[PDB]
Design a protein around this ligand. Sequence first.
Ligand SMILES: CC(=O)SCCNC(=O)CCNC(=O)[C@H](O)C(C)(C)COP(=O)(O)OP(=O)(O)OC[C@H]1O[C@@H](n2cnc3c(N)ncnc32)[C@H](O)[C@@H]1OP(=O)(O)O
Ligand SMILES: CC(=O)SCCNC(=O)CCNC(=O)[C@H](O)C(C)(C)COP(=O)(O)OP(=O)(O)OC[C@H]1O[C@@H](n2cnc3c(N)ncnc32)[C@H](O)[C@@H]1OP(=O)(O)O
Lengths: 213, 213, 394, 394
Amino acid sequence: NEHAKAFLGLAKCEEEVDAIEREVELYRLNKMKPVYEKRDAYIDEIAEFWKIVLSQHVSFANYIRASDFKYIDTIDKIKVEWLALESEMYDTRDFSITFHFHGIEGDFKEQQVTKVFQIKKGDGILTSEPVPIEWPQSYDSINPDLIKDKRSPEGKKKYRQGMKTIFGWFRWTGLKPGKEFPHGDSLASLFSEEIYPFCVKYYAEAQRDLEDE
Amino acid sequence: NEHAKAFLGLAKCEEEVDAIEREVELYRLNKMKPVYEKRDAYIDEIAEFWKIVLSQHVSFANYIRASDFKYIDTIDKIKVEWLALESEMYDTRDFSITFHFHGIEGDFKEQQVTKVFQIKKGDGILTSEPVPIEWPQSYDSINPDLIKDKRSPEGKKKYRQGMKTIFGWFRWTGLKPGKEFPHGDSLASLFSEEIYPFCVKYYAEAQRDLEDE
Amino acid sequence: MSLNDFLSSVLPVSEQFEYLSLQSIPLETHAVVTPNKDDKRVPKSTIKTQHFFSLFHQGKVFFSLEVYVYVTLWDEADAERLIFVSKADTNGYCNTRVSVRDITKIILEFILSIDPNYYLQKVKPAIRSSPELISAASTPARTLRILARRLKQSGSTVLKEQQDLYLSFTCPREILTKICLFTRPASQYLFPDSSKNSKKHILNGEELMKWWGFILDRLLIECFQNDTQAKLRIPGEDPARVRSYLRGMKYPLWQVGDIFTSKENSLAVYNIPLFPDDPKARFIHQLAEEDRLLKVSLSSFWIELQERQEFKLSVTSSVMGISGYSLATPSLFPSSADVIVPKSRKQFRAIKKYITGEEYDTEEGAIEAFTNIRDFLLLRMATNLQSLTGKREH
Amino acid sequence: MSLNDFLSSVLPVSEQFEYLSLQSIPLETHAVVTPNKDDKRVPKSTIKTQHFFSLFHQGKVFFSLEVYVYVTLWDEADAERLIFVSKADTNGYCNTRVSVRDITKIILEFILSIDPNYYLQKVKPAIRSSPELISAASTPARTLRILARRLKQSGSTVLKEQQDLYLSFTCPREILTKICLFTRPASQYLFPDSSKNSKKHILNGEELMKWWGFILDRLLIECFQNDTQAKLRIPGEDPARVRSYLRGMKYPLWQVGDIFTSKENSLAVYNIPLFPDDPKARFIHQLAEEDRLLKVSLSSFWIELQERQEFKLSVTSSVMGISGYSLATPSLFPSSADVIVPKSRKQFRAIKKYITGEEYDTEEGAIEAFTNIRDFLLLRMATNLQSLTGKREH
Ligand SMILES: CC(=O)SCCNC(=O)CCNC(=O)[C@H](O)C(C)(C)COP(=O)(O)OP(=O)(O)OC[C@H]1O[C@@H](n2cnc3c(N)ncnc32)[C@H](O)[C@@H]1OP(=O)(O)O
Ligand SMILES: CC(=O)SCCNC(=O)CCNC(=O)[C@H](O)C(C)(C)COP(=O)(O)OP(=O)(O)OC[C@H]1O[C@@H](n2cnc3c(N)ncnc32)[C@H](O)[C@@H]1OP(=O)(O)O
């Protein structure tokens, strides 16, 4: 019966450690917040810091059309924000990513986008809501909101195309498997766990003396 | 020149985040310490809690001779201690594992062993120092300290044999690749990251109604 | 006679061996062949079982065989059995020399003499039926809570069991025996890395095929009836080509083709049987994805299978098929010495991995794998292998 | 003539194509054949280069070829060149039909007309030489510090370059040309998943071998001299067997064997050349581990290679070897239209992965891989593919 005792005990622990981890995680999320704050500050004074990081990060360029780099180069600023700090209503793994593009003459407007990523129940998948952005005027051909019919044979063609640029990423949601941007959740996770958290390490490497890094 | 400014800054951050992580890690190590304390307390009142966990954990039995289970069954208690709490002289990933065997009549003494695992410089490998323990009287044949010559043809035979039991694990150091216990570092890591931290989850499963789990 | 009789009859005399006969617990499972909805006779039940064998010589393992037996029940006394041969493998760590071919053939005879009613006694259903049950749907918390209220209430932590949930069936001792297999040679099937052993002898494509075909030829004669239907198939080969191998076969009725012919339902998916790790299962499921299951005739199936690499870029593989009645009437519930039936999936798997899971690039592993099995049967099961006095002249 | 002439000469007339000729930066590397210490002539330098090609039709890629050229320097004017052919691959997404065989042969002619001195101008050494250098040995912190003291001191963040560290060599326009390759068929080499394309045509073992052998036969005639030494080898086959394939060869001097014979140093390791992804390299290194490198004769090497699975359980593969002098004198520094020479390993790899890295189970990827290349050459390199007006009757 001291056995009925010890069992009831462990069961308490079991329901606890679930909420205990949410704590060790909320700690790191807090510790990190102001550190990124300082850093970003510096970054913000460096020219072409982001332009440089994104073109050096090897894995990145796998996910997006080559043409996207003309626009990618314009990326003044990238900020990652973890939502679990603004309300216990949010998965420790939820976060948002803000970008700044400084556009180009008679082709790409200047803008700033924040897409939001949070997990959804069912071990839980990561997902996204669509968010607006001004596709370059070259991507007129493959613009979704410029295509009369996506089910038409030449319409599904052109849609599938623009869905492979980075802008097609901003629509991604992770609920239309095979229908949206490819691997959009991995990409988002790239940013949130590698590109943003090490953006510096990469800028240093791109800064190698002698063409060959 | 405000560029010479921002660069010197990031470099500070860079040397910092190394020591920042040592912090978020020391936090979790501390948070966990007393929780395991409570739990272990309960466990300690359960009979054959460890005997049960080790025989249910599927992966475990890959690493050690089948005969070792007669002795394995005797395992009253297993405690994991992370060294980074007792002096900043220790890798956040360093730790010790204490076992308790309650032996058996005229074959296995009753004992308690603590092997210690810490990392060594060079990304750093995990390693161990040898620690004493009373091998069962059956394992006389394959006892290292009962073999006159390990380089003799029948001596290397018998040595290689006892090196495959769990007791041959207590000698493991991770510096004689191919010469000692096989995968001894993985095993140690098994204990420290799965067996001990979830010992409960497994006891629950072994407690399934109907022979077939 | 006993398995033990059999093996001894095909091992050199005076010689001593040991062997393991593990056998799963007969589990009620889905239809071997995929049924079609609107169809008069669809199976009543399918009873799977696994036989696994492993020979030992001088405290080293050197051979192992994995065969599945499926017994199908259409109704009261309309039954049918199928022997499928999945994997046989050696590791060349046998000190003495033996006919792996006759070992294998024998082992199969033995499985062929087994009375199909053996598989019919208890049958672990596919989905079973007062609550308070711990199960795969019970968090550790829950389970613990349960063990607590069950203790505060009863003196102990166990329950009542009369407990009969465990299916039971019957059929005619003599039924339609089938045998199916797919020859494909590989470096190893059950002994990892043993291909890094020099003394290990590998048969190539056309070498395996004749080997196997001799084992079935021997069986069709000794064990099956003179109208038994035997078929061979060699993907990417010519009906003339096969007939030329077949003319090597002592058995008269060997024909080109397979035993799934059946003019009734001329569509692949409803004819091709589905087995573990089989290419037939493989290609099939492939077509489940790319959605062509209701579009490929059995006729086409064969033709397409040959392309799509795998076969296109691998040595000779053949599909053999048998379908007949056994000479004698199968009628042998095996002894505890004939099989060893683990308490659970868990334990069954456990003992198999002691062998299949070991590394074999060194006689170390084969020695290891033997001891670890005897140690274990003794310890956790109060049992031990069977010893064999080989009794075969020359 | 130009590569552009060549390809156009073997594509159907009126037809338009596009193609990519990427070429690495000639890098001073270790000896093709493993040298032995105590040996009179050991190479002075080995100059590696990679040629990579990819054809396009209607904005889809459909073919690509990966060949390495190695130029060895024993001294002042004792030189020697070797063409190795690693991978050729198709994805069956060509709308029109073409002779992949003549495309490949041609491309090789062209590489054969190249003056070996082309590879001799600049050569990125294997290990280069006032500090203050950022490099793979510079933490991000460090590097930043450096960029800071270099800015506080100079107006900018760059340095001085005259900068000449970049080796330079010369040899006789006419040298010993060799060609080596190892036929092995596989589902795909450079176009992932393209085997999931139906319209893709795969040659089996004995199908590849004749294909390749026709390409070399054509070359030995048109391009090499009448005493050139040509050899074939078919692992797990009979010297009589090969001679029977060889009797199909228009070239007179085709013999059984290989071009590494050399009675001087009768030991495998010091004869077998070592190439990317090659089985010869493979088996070799295998013996480095299990320590048998100073124990297997070249004679033995061949014999052992055949066993040890791989070959033992794979279709026909053959090793072809050439060693002679070219008819004409190779003498062609290629135009910017003939090659495209990325600034770095980094960029080179970058453009190759646009192709080799794409998925091809759908004409989607092949379309993708084309656009992404032209987009990219234009963007980051101010260049673009070569357009082709096919000019071959019938
Ligand atoms: C559908 C299925 O069940 S698939 C399983 C497929 N499995 C594999 O491919 C695993 C790899 N293959 C192997 O491990 C084995 O070769 C087996 C089991 C296929 C055959 O085993 P073997 O021992 O080679 O065959 P077995 O011992 O019966 O003798 C076969 C022949 O080889 C000879 N032989 C036996 N050992 C050797 C050896 N070391 N070297 C050369 N020949 C040998 C025998 O004399 C016999 O030749 P013969 O017919 O001229 O008398
Ligand atoms: C050492 C090395 O370089 S190794 C590289 C090995 N690579 C591979 O194995 C990749 C897989 N193989 C392939 O992708 C390709 O088959 C290749 C490149 C090997 C050959 O390409 P193909 O297009 O088949 O050959 P090619 O176009 O020159 O024509 C070859 C034959 O097939 C025929 N052919 C062409 N397309 C098809 C088709 N779809 N179906 C049937 N036959 C075809 C041609 O008529 C010719 O036959 P012929 O000699 O009777 O006239």
